[PDB]
């Protein structure tokens, strides 16, 4: 298991524009296109993301290319963030995958708002971080996915994904 396989399980793959759990136009493997309610604004972000006239449909290769870029950008976002970087550097490799999953889902500003959980993760107080992470809109909106990520932070294993 690795971050790519983890996020493919949590995000799925759709080759045609769709609306994510929040109602936002999305394509591929969780590639958010726009928060705007306009489907034409989404298609136009799609053509620009891909470099051709898609008409709202992409192939598997293109979905995988977006995915690769997004994972890369989440990693680099973590490493440039003053709050996130010290936390990420303190973690083992499995639990690093969980941090990237959160950032991928909610952006770096989002995760950097989990101040209390971050501190408990840094101190390696796993059970206490799991409890604090669960007290969140994120957990209440997407509990199944949130539990998978929380368990990964809690145990340091891929069990929730196996
Ligand atoms: Cl892009
Ligand atoms: Cl979920």
From Swiss-Prot:
UniProt subcellular location: Host cytoplasm
Family statement: Belongs to the glycosyl hydrolase 24 family.
Gene behind the chain: E
InterPro entries associated with the record: Endolysin_T4_type, Glyco_hydro_24, Lysozyme-like_dom_sf, Lysozyme_dom_sf, Phage_lysozyme-like, T4-type_lysozyme
Signal peptide: none
EC number(s) on file: 3.2.1.17
GO cellular component terms given for this protein: host cell cytoplasm
Protein name, entry field: Endolysin
Keywords noted in UniProt: Antimicrobial, Bacteriolytic enzyme, Cytolysis, Glycosidase, Host cell lysis by virus, Host cytoplasm, Hydrolase, Viral release from host cell
Active-site positions on this chain: 11, 20
Amino acids binding substrate: 32, 104, 117, 132
CDD domains in the cross-refs: T4-like_lys
Effect upon mutating residue 11 to Q: Complete loss of activity
Enzyme class, spelled out: hydrolase
GO biological process terms, semicolon-separated: cell wall macromolecule catabolic process; defense response to bacterium; peptidoglycan catabolic process; viral release from host cell by cytolysis
Reported impact of residue 26 to H: Facilitates transglycosylation more effectively than hydrolysis; covalently bound substrate
Effect recorded for residue 11 to A/F/H/M/N: Complete loss of enzymatic activity
Gene3D superfamilies xref list: 1.10.530.40
Comment on pH dependence: Optimum pH is 7.3.
């Amino acid at each position: 298991m690795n971050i790519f396989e983890m996020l493919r399980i949590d995000e799925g793959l759709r080759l045609k524009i769709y609306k994510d759990t929040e109602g936002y136009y999305t394509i591929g493997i969780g590639h958010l296109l726009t928060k705007s309610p306009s489907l034409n604004a989404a298609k136009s972000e799609l053509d620009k993301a891909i470099g051709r006239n898609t008409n709202g449909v992409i192939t598997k290769d293109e979905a995988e290319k977006l995915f690769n870029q997004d994972v890369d950008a989440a990693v680099r976002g973590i490493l440039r963030n003053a709050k996130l970087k010290p936390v990420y550097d303190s973690l083992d490799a499995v639990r690093r995958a969980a941090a990237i999953n959160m950032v991928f889902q909610m952006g770096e500003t989002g995760v950097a708002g989990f101040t209390n959980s971050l501190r408990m993760l840094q101190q390696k107080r796993w059970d206490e971080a799991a409890v604090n992470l669960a007290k969140s809109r994120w957990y209440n909106q997407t509990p199944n996915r949130a539990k998978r990520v929380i368990t990964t932070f809690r145990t340091g294993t891929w069990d929730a994904y196996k």
